[PDB]
């Protein structure tokens, strides 16, 4: 970026929401960051359009955890979503689990443990176990990621594009 990232983000992991409320012509600096991060994740995921942007973060109830170091390394975006989830008895149930919506580590530093670092921090602040999560179209990398770090192995295939794991049916999800 053309800005003092460390001045804007003093902390290693910055937690932001619909209010890009800085840790205001730098609340616009936050925007440019979210906007570029989202496009980078799109290119990495072979998406024609980003699923993360400033315009959209403002229009939703999503939380982004931005990772920096001592230059933005990556991010993970989460949110609670009303999903009507298929169980093992072909029954659909309304739940509101915490969902992983976007997740990106810059290519140069992928597979250095930064994903886990960002993921553990999110799990701690959100106070959730990995098996309570629903994931929006997990990539092959994310599936191996989740299996190594948390022993997550896919359960009942959904008809929506979310994926849940063995253990999901244990919480009430509000």
Ligand X SMILES: CC(=O)SCCNC(=O)CCNC(=O)[C@H](O)C(C)(C)COP(=O)(O)OP(=O)(O)OC[C@H]1O[C@@H](n2cnc3c(N)ncnc32)[C@H](O)[C@@H]1OP(=O)(O)O
Q: How many whole angstroms separate alpha carbon 28 and alpha carbon 69?
A: 21
Q: Is 110 annotated as belonging to a binding site?
A: yes
- Residue 3 marked in a binding site: no
The residue within the footprint of ligand X, chosen from 9, 65, 75, 104 (CB under 6 A), is: 104
110: contact with ligand X by CB under 6 A: yes
Nearest to 80 by CA among 99, 66, 106, 65: 99
SS3 161: coil
| 148 belongs to the binding site for ligand X (CB under 6 A) | yes
Per-residue mark of binding to ligand X, 40-69 (x: CB under 6 A): ----xx------------------------
DSSP-derived letter for residue 165 is B
Give Cα 42 to chain centroid, integer Å. 13
Cβ neighbours, 10 Å, residue 34: 24
Which of 9, 65, 75, 103 binds ligand X (CB under 6 A)? It is 103
- According to the annotation, is 41 in a ligand binding site? no
Check binding of 145 to ligand X (CB under 6 A). yes
167 is in an annotated binding site: no
| 100 sits near ligand X (criterion: CB under 6 A) | yes
Question: Considering the rule CB under 6 A, would residue 97 count as an interface residue with ligand X?
Answer: no
CA distance 49 to 43: 9
The answer to the question of whether 145 is labelled as a binding residue is yes
Choice from 135, 152, 162, 168 touching ligand X (CB under 6 A): 135
Closest contact distance (angstroms) between CB of 51 and ligand X is 8
Tell me phi and psi for residue 141, to 5 degrees: -60, -45
Lookup result for tokens 């960002």: 118
């Amino acid at each position: 970026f053309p800005f003092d990232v460390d001045a804007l983000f003093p902390e290693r992991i910055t937690v932001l929401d619909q209010h890009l409320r800085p840790p205001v012509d730098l609340q616009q600096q936050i925007m440019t960051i979210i906007d570029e991060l989202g496009k980078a994740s799109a290119k990495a995921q072979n998406l024609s359009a980003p699923i993360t942007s400033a315009s959209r973060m403002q229009s939703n109830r999503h939380v982004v955890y931005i990772l920096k170091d001592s230059a933005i390394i990556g991010f993970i975006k989460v949110g609670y979503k009303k999903l009507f989830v298929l169980d093992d008895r072909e029954a659909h149930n309304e739940v509101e689990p915490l969902c992983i919506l976007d997740f990106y580590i810059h290519e140069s530093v992928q597979r250095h443990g930064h994903g886990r670092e960002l993921f553990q921090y999110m799990l701690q602040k959100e106070r959730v176990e990995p098996h309570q999560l629903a994931i929006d179209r997990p990539s092959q990398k994310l599936l191996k990621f989740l299996n190594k770090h948390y022993n997550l192995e896919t359960t009942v295939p959904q008809v929506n594009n979310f994926v849940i794991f063995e253990g999901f049916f244990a919480h009430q999800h509000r």
